[PDB]
């Protein structure tokens, strides 16, 4: 059988797209044959995102896979909750509860607060980004106000690349006034590299500082210049290479040619690509369970336009939503389980510390304990 789905990828998602294709090749089943429609389009704006969503919905797809930023998340969530079209995404979780949205990135505020309480910090810096939402900043501020902490927030997102030398040096000199040595970095895999380069240039990686990379991928960024400085740093990791399945996937991943699959000749792997692989596995398992349920989920391709008013959704939408919410299978990130809302539960986040020989695991985090 054929199950038409939708695929949205931003400009520069070559690794995520290659991981998606590898997961589609690996998870093959005679019960159903998928047929995605990949539409490369930047998720920075909203008009093009709405156009791509309407184009994918006009074909009459069942599930839609795509990314979104802190700006184009509201329109995507509304279009998904209105037409009852399910959505799978490995990006940052939304605010509050939102139906017909199946996220893949676990929450990081809990693990961050746990690490802060374990390290027993009183005053530190907080460098965040405006692309991963403002929920974690509000959570940190509330925790500091409840525990009587001396925190400070500096928005490093509006820093342009022209005056990167003056802006970073000036903000670091201003932070030096308060005699603060502990800095928490909360950015994507791009700004953290610039911050590390600026710290290396200004000479702040000497022993006496402690940095925290607030992201799911700690080994993703370059760390060959910090481990030799002397300032021990800590980060969060979602995928563990010590597992048998992850090691086998890495072994079968490095052997792939770079000409066909871009970004393959690399020992490590991005957490976004691993979450995309896990999402492909979850979609495959949900479609297999739906086919085994002896239900006639097949519908006609006469959905029409997306902006139709009034729009009447179909019961297959809530059916596949419940099927996706009632799935549980292993993967690269470990155990996969969703609640009634759609957020990930029963996940294990690994805390890593950077040593002289390399990153070393010191423990794990969970939601129960």
């Amino acid at each position, epitope marked *: *059988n*054929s199950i*038409q789905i939708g695929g949205l990828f931003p400009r520069g998602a070559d690794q995520e797209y290659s991981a998606f*294709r*590898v997961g*589609m*090749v*690996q*998870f*093959s*089943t*005679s*019960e159903f*044959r998928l*047929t*995605p*429609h*990949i539409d490369n389009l930047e998720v920075a704006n909203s008009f093009a995102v709405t156009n791509a969503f309407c184009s994918q919905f006009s*074909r009459g797809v069942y599930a839609i896979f795509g990314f979104y930023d802190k700006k184009s998340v509201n329109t995507i969530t509304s279009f998904c909750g209105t037409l009852h079209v399910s959505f799978i995404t490995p990006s940052f979780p939304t605010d509050g509860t939102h139906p017909f949205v199946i996220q893949m990135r676990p929450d990081l505020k809990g693990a961050l607060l746990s690490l802060i309480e374990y390290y027993q910090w009183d005053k530190f810096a907080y460098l965040y980004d405006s692309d991963r939402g403002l929920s974690t900043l509000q959570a940190v501020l509330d925790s500091a106000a409840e525990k009587k902490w001396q925190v400070t927030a500096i928005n490093v997102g509006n820093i342009n690349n022209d005056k990167k030398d003056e802006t970073y040096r000036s903000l670091f000199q201003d932070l030096e006034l308060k005699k603060e040595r502990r800095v928490i970095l909360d950015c994507e895999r791009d700004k953290v590299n610039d911050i590390v380069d600026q710290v290396i240039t200004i000479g702040k990686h000497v022993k006496g500082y402690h940095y925290i990379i607030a992201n799911l991928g700690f080994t993703d960024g370059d760390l060959l210049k910090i481990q030799f400085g002397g300032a021990n740093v800590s980060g969060f990791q979602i995928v563990d290479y010590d597992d048998s399945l992850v090691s086998k996937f890495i072994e*079968r991943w490095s052997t792939l040619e770079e*000409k*066909e699959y871009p970004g393959a000749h690399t020992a490590t792997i991005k957490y976004t690509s691993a979450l995309t692989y896990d999402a492909v596995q979850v979609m495959t398992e949900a479609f297999r369970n739906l086919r085994k349920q002896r239900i006639e989920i097949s519908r006609r*391709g006469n959905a029409g336009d997306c902006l139709a008013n009034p729009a009447v959704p179909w019961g297959q939408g809530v059916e596949i939503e419940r099927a996706l919410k009632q799935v549980q299978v292993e993967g690269l990130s470990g155990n996969i389980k969703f609640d009634q809302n759609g957020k990930r539960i029963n996940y294990t986040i690994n805390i890593m510390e950077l040593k002289t020989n390399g990153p070393r695991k010191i423990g794990y985090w969970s939601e129960v304990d």
Partner: antibody
Amino acid sequence: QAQLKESGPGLVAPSQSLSITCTVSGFSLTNYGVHWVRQPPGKGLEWLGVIWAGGSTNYNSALMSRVSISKDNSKSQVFLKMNSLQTDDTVMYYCAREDYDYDWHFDVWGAGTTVTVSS
Amino acid sequence: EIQMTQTTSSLSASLGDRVTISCRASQDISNYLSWYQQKPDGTVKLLIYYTSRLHSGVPSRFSGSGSGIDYSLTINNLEQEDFATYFCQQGNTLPLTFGAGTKLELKR
């Protein structure tokens, strides 16, 4: 690079099975899938069967009661055993592997071997 | 099932021309077609992906277009090695039934 070399008997009498092996060379046998398509002489090639990497198979509705493909992850060979061969089975068979380039495009395609089913 | 049937049975032309082979369909294929060329020896190779792109290694002269239920591939300039067959396979709904395909040759 990947490749696909198919092996066969070439000549077989009627009312007998047609077993053909295809050694997967250049790629893994437990990661990517493999399909078997039969090409008639001077006609359009029709899909006979497809052995998915998960273990299951997708037999076509034409010869579902006469074709059965088996997998072998150890020898990296997909044995294509076609039982109850007819008199018009004097055609060539070639196996190929699927890919993922935003469409179901079979890139890795072998040369295939010929057969002359005659009693 | 989608039974893709080629309209042109056998079309031939001279060098330096631009031929256009068509390929019909029984139902909607969602532009999930592929125009693969097959030489007379038996070696085949995929040249068109999703009926709109070109595979890695194919010549830059080969191209295609068309959406819906009727597609067609158009080459830029015919050559000596391009004079061969051209099959079409629709992998939208299993089982993927490939088309017959025409055969290009030199005219005299």
